[PDB]
Amino acid sequence: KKWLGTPIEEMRRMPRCGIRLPLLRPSANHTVTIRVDLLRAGEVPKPFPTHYKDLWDNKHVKMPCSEQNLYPVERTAGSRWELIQTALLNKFTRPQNLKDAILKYNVAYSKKWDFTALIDFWDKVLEEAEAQHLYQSILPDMVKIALCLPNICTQPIPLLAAAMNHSITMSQEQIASLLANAFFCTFPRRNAKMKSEYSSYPDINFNRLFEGRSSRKPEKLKTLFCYFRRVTAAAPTGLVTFTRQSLEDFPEWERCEKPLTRLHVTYEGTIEENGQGMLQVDFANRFVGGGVTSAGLVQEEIRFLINPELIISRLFTEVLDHNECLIITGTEQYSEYTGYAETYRWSRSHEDGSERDDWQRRCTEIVAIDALHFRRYLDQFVPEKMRRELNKAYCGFLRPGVSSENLSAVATGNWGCGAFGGDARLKALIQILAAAAAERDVVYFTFGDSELMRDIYSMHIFLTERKLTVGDVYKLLLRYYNEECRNCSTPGPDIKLYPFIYHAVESC
Numbered sequence: 001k002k003w004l005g006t007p008i009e010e011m012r013r014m015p016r017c018g019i020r021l022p023l024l025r026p027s028a029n030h031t032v033t034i035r036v037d038l039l040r041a042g043e044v045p046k047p048f049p050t051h052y053k054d055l056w057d058n059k060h061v062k063m064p065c066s067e068q069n070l071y072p073v074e075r076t077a078g079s080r081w082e083l084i085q086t087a088l089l090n091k092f093t094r095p096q097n098l099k100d101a102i103l104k105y106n107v108a109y110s111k112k113w114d115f116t117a118l119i120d121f122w123d124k125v126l127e128e129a130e131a132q133h134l135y136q137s138i139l140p141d142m143v144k145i146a147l148c149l150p151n152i153c154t155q156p157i158p159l160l161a162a163a164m165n166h167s168i169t170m171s172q173e174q175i176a177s178l179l180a181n182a183f184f185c186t187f188p189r190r191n192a193k194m195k196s197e198y199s200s201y202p203d204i205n206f207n208r209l210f211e212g213r214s215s216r217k218p219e220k221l222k223t224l225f226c227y228f229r230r231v232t233a234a235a236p237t238g239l240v241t242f243t244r245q246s247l248e249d250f251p252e253w254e255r256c257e258k259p260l261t262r263l264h265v266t267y268e269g270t271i272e273e274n275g276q277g278m279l280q281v282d283f284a285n286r287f288v289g290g291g292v293t294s295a296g297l298v299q300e301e302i303r304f305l306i307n308p309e310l311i312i313s314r315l316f317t318e319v320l321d322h323n324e325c326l327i328i329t330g331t332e333q334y335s336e337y338t339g340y341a342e343t344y345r346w347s348r349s350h351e352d353g354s355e356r357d358d359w360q361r362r363c364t365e366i367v368a369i370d371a372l373h374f375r376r377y378l379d380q381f382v383p384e385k386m387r388r389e390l391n392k393a394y395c396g397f398l399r400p401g402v403s404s405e406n407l408s409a410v411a412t413g414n415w416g417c418g419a420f421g422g423d424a425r426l427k428a429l430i431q432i433l434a435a436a437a438a439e440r441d442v443v444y445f446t447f448g449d450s451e452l453m454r455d456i457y458s459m460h461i462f463l464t465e466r467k468l469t470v471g472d473v474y475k476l477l478l479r480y481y482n483e484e485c486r487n488c489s490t491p492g493p494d495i496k497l498y499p500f501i502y503h504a505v506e507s508c
């Protein structure tokens with residue numbers, strides 16, 4: 001069988017399961033950077049305010065176009081934005097031109113940043129006609145949208161700092177201008193290895209994409225240039241929302257009397273293609289987006305590449321703490337891919353068919369939740385660590401003050417179980433428990449592992465038929481830790497989690 005459990009057709013999906021969205025309006029906990037009174041289907045949003053307003057402080061993005069973005073001139077102060085304009089407005093005919101341009105306003109990194117991948121992409125991968133299109137058309141249009149920034153991003157953008165429950169809704173056009181700036185590496189205070197202020201934020205400037213000779217760089221660049229060509233040729237018209245969510249109160253899991261919810265589990269398909277209208281899980285790093293702007297190319301980075309609007313979260317999203325997540329609604333898919341990791345390839349341009357909601361956001365909700373990175377297998381069965389993963393997933397899944405009927409299914413899979421070393425069977429149970437507490441169903445993609453599909457299905461049906469509650473199951477996990485893990489002095493326990501559970505339940 002290719003899938004097991006509840007038929008997928010019986011699962012909830014947006015926009016049809018959603019409550020009617022309230023009127024989009026700015027408030028204390030929601031920054032909105034466009035004219036809501038003028039928001040209209042098929043029209044490019046109008047920025048609010050009309051003219052550029054600048055904040056250069058501890059609580060906001062430091063814009064490249066700030067009048068406070070200054071550089072010491074050899075002993076005076078000069079405008080970095082003027083320097084950027086001067087640098088980027090020359091014609092490029094060879095890759096060195098682009099490097100020299102970028103380095104003019106990054107003089108301190110002129111020996112630290114490597115541009116080999118950029119040069120090799122342009123000179124040694126691209127055909128002549130492709131190179132020419134790059135430097136005659138794509139790059140100069142990217143410069144122009146980048147330098148429009150003060151006309152496009154007129155409103156200060158608040159940092160989504162630790163412990164803030166806050167949303168930012170901006171236009172895709174606004175995101176394009178900002179991401180063109182990141183490509184040209186124009187964001188100040190985001191470069192130094194010994195940086196203090198932004199040391200708790202991810203990289204945003206794209207310099208590490210131009211590094212080294214990994215054969216995956218041409219594929220990353222092609223995916224991004226597909227995006228940049230699309231958004232500079234024709235301005236996108238939708239909005240995107242970025243929400244930091246920090247929960248205070250977490251369940252007493254051992255006491256949770258909620259029953260398990262429904263499961264569909266399948267070894268075919270992916271979260272992004274087959275999770276339409278469902279809460280899509282991003283298997284995140286705490287620094288959101290992971291290595292997308294450097295050498296990362298697994299689940300999170302592939303999603304950030306094919307939906308590049310995700311990357312901008314890096315500009316304003318502080319490292320996630322154990323009780324936090326980031327929820328992004330409205331990103332658009334611009335590319336298709338084949339492969340994964342060192343076999344990843346840009347396939348072709350994608351024409352996103354998603355409907356938009358009443359706020360003109362693509363009906364695509366993605367949550368970044370970072371699992372723990374386990375160095376040793378048994379580490380993950382320690383109860384503090386099991387509880388941490390439950391609470392993380394719960395925060396990702398829970399939507400405060402929304403009823404169950406209006407909650408889509410969760411589209412997830414092997415969270416924390418590739419690069420992060422987790423056990424899939426344990427995490428699957430953890431996600432099922434968290435989903436149950438949040439009152440959502442689970443659509444679980446095993447990414448080609450048919451045996452894991454059967455195993456997750458069988459356990460889930462076994463616990464459901466026996467009517468075990470979230471608490472009953474969590475207690476079983478604690479039992480497995482005490483009996484099989486706590487003073488197991490060897491690398492692997494004597495018996496595995498699922499057989500333990502079956503035996504513990506049937507003999508009771």
Ligand SMILES: Nc1ncnc2c1ncn2[C@@H]1O[C@H](COP(=O)(O)OP(=O)(O)OC[C@H]2NC[C@H](O)[C@@H]2O)[C@@H](O)[C@H]1O
Nearest residue numbers: 271283285290298299300413414416417418419420447
């Ligand atoms: N598109 C897609 N759909 C479903 N399942 C997938 C997909 N891509 C990968 N997978 C499965 O999910 C598994 C976990 O993916 P991975 O990217 O390794 O997630 P981790 O949580 O272990 O790693 C997180 C870290 N890597 C990048 C992040 O920024 C973190 O640094 C992986 O081994 C596959 O079995």
